[PDB]
Amino acid sequence: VNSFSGYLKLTDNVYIKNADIVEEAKKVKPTVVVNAANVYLKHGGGVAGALNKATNNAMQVESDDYIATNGPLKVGGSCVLSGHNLAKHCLHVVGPNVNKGEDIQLLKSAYENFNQHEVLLAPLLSAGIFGADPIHSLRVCVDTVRTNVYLAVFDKNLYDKLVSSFL
Numbered sequence: 001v002n003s004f005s006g007y008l009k010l011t012d013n014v015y016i017k018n019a020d021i022v023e024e025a026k027k028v029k030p031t032v033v034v035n036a037a038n039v040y041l042k043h044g045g046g047v048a049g050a051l052n053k054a055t056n057n058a059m060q061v062e063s064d065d066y067i068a069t070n071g072p073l074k075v076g077g078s079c080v081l082s083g084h085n086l087a088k089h090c091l092h093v094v095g096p097n098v099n100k101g102e103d104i105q106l107l108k109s110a111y112e113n114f115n116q117h118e119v120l121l122a123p124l125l126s127a128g129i130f131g132a133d134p135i136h137s138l139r140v141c142v143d144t145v146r147t148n149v150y151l152a153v154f155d156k157n158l159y160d161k162l163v164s165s166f167l
């Protein structure tokens, strides 16, 4: 039993909710919140820009030190950093950004990072400003993640289509 509330159940392990991941994070304080990161950990917009704003830019400061030490992530890769005031940890996961021409096949690799954590709060990878079809992202999530994932979908209109079309 966990404190995630109001979710619709999709499969043995995936739950979905029309919700602002920022507001969900502050309420639940999950062990892991997933960020929709880029390889440079430049949290400018989309989910990343909003999460970073909620940390008063502490996420960006920590991220800049991470990159200065380690260099960029791989598309499909991840790193674990602090969750600041939002969660214990933030798993920064880089899905492909279609508006950069990145290969969509890497979306499965991106979701595989979730399997290293028993429970996560997350957005749909490569959705929003990364330019992938969220219906496809949800399908890859369900077919790749085996740990318990609670998906927050910000757009209510998008949320209803994912459910009604869900196979």
Ligand SMILES: Cc1c[nH]c2ncnc(NCC(C)(C)O)c12
Pocket (backbone or CB within 6 Å): 019, 020, 021, 022, 046, 047, 050, 123, 124, 127, 128, 129, 134, 152, 153, 154, 155
């Ligand atoms: C931008 C944002 C802020 N808080 C969020 N919580 C969940 N999903 C999000 N992004 C979804 C999409 C499809 C617009 O990228 C967000």
Ligand SMILES: [Cl-]
Pocket (backbone or CB within 6 Å): 045, 046, 047, 127, 128, 129, 130
């Ligand atoms: Cl977005």
